[PDB]
Design a binder for these strands. Structure first.
Ligand SMILES: Cc1cc2nc3c(=O)[nH]c(=O)nc-3n(C[C@H](O)[C@H](O)[C@H](O)COP(=O)(O)OP(=O)(O)OC[C@H]3O[C@@H](n4cnc5c(N)ncnc54)[C@H](O)[C@@H]3O)c2cc1C
Length: 508
DNA sequence: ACAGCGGTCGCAGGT
DNA sequence: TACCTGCGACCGCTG
């Protein structure tokens, strides 16, 4: 066994055992030749990034929990997880040599950083004689294949995208890999010999530098929770079958949607498995919704954005971004700060920004409200600033999804009906007329009657005192006047669209 | 050509 | 309940 070669699976996304072709392939190969190989399933953790402010504490905790679950599940297959601290550039040269790696597998990703990181790894592997097998299992459809089927271009409308993907085959969804047979623990490398726990899963203390930023642990990380949560969602087949996104509440105290996004983002849940389960249900339920508003339709939106994103490295910026309207957003530092911390003076907006910071998830339409307010609706601040804040706070932060939906909300791409503007006062009332959600997340306003809790500036000073919260003292004065600025911004939007039109027809 | 259709998720005021 | 209309006058696709 001093002569064994090592098979490595590199986890980045795809933090699950189920439906993981890259992982299954390694386990299958090991069991094929019994005394031949050692198996190392690894996650590479750069210990310097633990302070990167672009990752908030709630998301670190989710990753910590996820790695622990992944180690637990691997232990059942007579394996374990190896969390190797460092950067791939230095880690791979060392372990290819140390472990005598024969093969390396991972799930592909389309993000710019990942494309260049993986090309580097492929380059090293090729030069060092390591075979590399990659798999597209993060999405149901391979963006490269969609773009190729569409003659070299990513489809820019959803219905056209659907028309392409129904021409594509959907791969088989796999189970969990097989238990390893006759597999002693690998020999310690030089790092392990110095410290036996060198590759153990990180503790909370090691991942979470700022525990004071942690909120209630409403969505625990890992594949186990992912499947449990999915199964609980799929249980009411009528709800599943009749689901229409636009009719779900943004302010219900309990989520009106699945809340599978963080699990889909990390790959704790396979999108292909979830797609498969939904199809089985739709087949059973004669009365059901269809894309774009159906539950399957939502998975297809995820697929849609991954595809437009895969063709555009600047997807997360305005400048140099092929899809994006060039719009003269403004710098408004004080306003940005107030929006970021849920101190705009609009209680609905503030409640949402507060839930997001505290819990790491807010409903899609709650994201609409704050994203509209920040950009074209009210503050006239760049969607890129909003994206930055969401990136920090969201458990489900997803490069492609965040960028795509921020462009949609700001009417920069995909959505163009800018005359439709969410009211920070009116929008939430439809689903929460008593303002329970505001009372919860903005407790200072909790005694305000429903008749002015969405618009506290309507309360006289004697009323404010009776409610125990005086504006400008206990809660902020509204930063801008929606009824004025949104009308001026609609005009700004039309003006920018016109400039973009000229430029287009001008390139001809 | 260039107008007409459809477009995941607007508001306010109708009935 | 769950539509309907005016507001002003978007885009991408289609033929
Ligand atoms: C400004 C803005 C920023 C966003 N940033 C992210 C993000 O960083 N990461 C992320 O996962 N979602 C993002 N979303 C999309 C959407 O709001 C979330 O995916 C959804 O709220 C997740 O909740 P759920 O799992 O209950 O969704 P469900 O309605 O139960 O849908 C199931 C799954 O379908 C996918 N899905 C649903 N809606 C969308 C959508 N609009 N776009 C793409 N996929 C979707 C998600 O994977 C979701 O988990 C953003 C939306 C907006 C408006």
């Amino acid at each position: 066994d001093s002569q064994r070669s090592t098979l490595v699976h590199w986890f980045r996304k795809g933090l699950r055992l189920h439906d993981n072709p890259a992982l299954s392939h390694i386990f299958t190969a090991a069991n094929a030749a019994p005394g031949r190989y050692f198996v190392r399933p690894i996650f590479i953790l750069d210990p310097g990034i633990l302070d990167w402010m672009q990752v908030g504490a709630n998301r670190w905790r989710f990753l910590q929990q996820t790695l622990e679950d992944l180690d637990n599940q691997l232990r059942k297959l007579n394996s374990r997880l190896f969390v190797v601290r460092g950067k791939p550039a230095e880690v791979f040269p060392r372990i290819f040599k140390s472990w005598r790696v024969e093969m390396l597998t991972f799930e592909t990703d389309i993000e710019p950083y990942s494309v260049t990181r993986d090309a580097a790894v492929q380059k090293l592997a090729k030069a060092e004689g390591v075979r590399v097998e990659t798999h597209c299992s993060h999405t149901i459809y391979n963006p490269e294949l969609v773009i190729a089927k569409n003659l070299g271009k990513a489809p820019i409308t959803y219905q056209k995208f659907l028309g392409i993907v129904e021409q594509l085959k959907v791969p088989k969804v796999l189970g969990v890999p097989e238990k390893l047979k006759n597999m002693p623990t690998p020999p310690k490398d030089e790092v392990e010999q110095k410290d036996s726990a060198a590759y153990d899963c990180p503790t909370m203390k090691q991942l979470v530098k700022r525990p004071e930023e942690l909120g209630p642990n409403k969505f625990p990380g890992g594949e186990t929770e992912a499947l449990r949560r999915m199964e609980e969602s799929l249980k009411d087949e009528i709800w599943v079958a009749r689901f229409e996104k636009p009719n779900t509440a943004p302010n219900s105290l309990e989520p009106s949607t699945t809340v599978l996004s963080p699990y889909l983002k990390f790959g704790c849940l396979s999108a292909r498995l979830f797609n498969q389960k939904l199809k089985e249900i739709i087949k059973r339920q004669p009365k059901h919704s269809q894309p774009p508003v159906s539950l399957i339709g939502q998975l297809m939106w995820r697929e849609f954005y991954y595809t437009v994103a895969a063709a555009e490295p600047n997807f997360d910026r305005m400048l140099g971004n092929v899809y994006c309207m060039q719009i003269p957003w403004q710098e408004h530092p004080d306003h940005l700060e107030a929006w970021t911390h849920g101190r705009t003076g609009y209680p609905f907006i503030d409640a949402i920004m507060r839930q997001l910071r505290q819990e790491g998830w807010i409903h899609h339409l709650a994201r609409h409200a704050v994203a509209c307010f920040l950009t074209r609706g009210d503050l006239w601040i760049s969607w890129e600033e909003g994206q930055r804040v969401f990136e920090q706070l969201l458990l489900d932060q997803d490069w492609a999804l965040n960028a795509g939906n921020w462009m949609w909300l700001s009417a920069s791409a995909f959505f163009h009906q800018y005359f439709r503007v969410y009211s920070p006062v009116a929008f939430g009332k439809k689903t929460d007329p008593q303002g329970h959600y505001i009372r919860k997340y903005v407790p200072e306003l909790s005694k305000y009657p429903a008749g002015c809790i969405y618009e506290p500036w309507k309360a006289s000073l004697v009323d404010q005192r009776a409610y125990g919260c005086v504006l400008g003292t206990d809660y902020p004065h509204r930063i801008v006047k929606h009824e004025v600025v949104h009308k001026e911004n609609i005009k700004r939007m039309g003006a920018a669209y016109k400039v973009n039109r000229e430029v287009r027809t001008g390139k001809e």
